[PDB]
Structure of Dehydrosqualene synthase:
Amino acid sequence: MTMMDMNFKYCHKIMKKHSKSFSYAFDLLPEDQRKAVWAIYAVCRKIDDSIIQFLNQIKEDIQSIEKYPYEYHHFQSDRRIMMALQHVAQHKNIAFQSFYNLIDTVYKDQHFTMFETDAELFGYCYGVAGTVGEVLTPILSDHETHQTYDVARRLGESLQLINILRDVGEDFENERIYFSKQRLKQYEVDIAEVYQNGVNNHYIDLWEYYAAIAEKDFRDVMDQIKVFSIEAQPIIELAARIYIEILDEVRQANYTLHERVFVEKRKKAKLFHEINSKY
């Protein structure tokens, strides 16, 4: 194990720790591509969880890599992750503005205010996840075009909406509600009231309104999976399918606001079999 291998192993650890779903799928990529995915995911994870001193440090470190990718930097944030990101930047095109969009989104989230409309909720999904899809685009495709970015960005936003749909309860405990005030009012849903008394038809209809949006986006992405490299296609399909299975798991747990549902490992393997066969 070289030092750089140690840096990537650490990125891998962070990714496996936080997303068993994405690590399950992306770890199937060829060595060079999975290593780059671990690094991008690790950087985004650190940014997502930073809260502002460390966040400012991460931004300056990324800015250093962007400006001087081949100079040695004494990184201020997490050296292992930045050394790995820099290694990737030296071999692949990195959409740096997408990392800055993510950082800007996480900063704003300090003075969190509920979203007035679905447009702001979707803007948020772009900021924390559509951005990661854009950064991953060059790793997952041979000849990136605007269409490749568009599909990756859409998948990322769809996965963030599935995430929000799985975590309503836990997010409410953490004083956060992601459904828009417009939609909550239209459907006559009060999250605190539902957290207290259980799901009702108003809440279920609202949750299903967002789930249909995520599912539709998921289908449009699967329809355009060929923008990605032949090796990455089944892997992206697997990651997306495993994640969207969370929606059925939420349904099977009666939309509970009191536990985090999950797709068990044996079910992820079943999806891998089905896709691996199709391919």
About this structure: The chain has one domain: 1-279. The longest helix spans residues 118-140. The chain is about 70% helix and 0% strand.
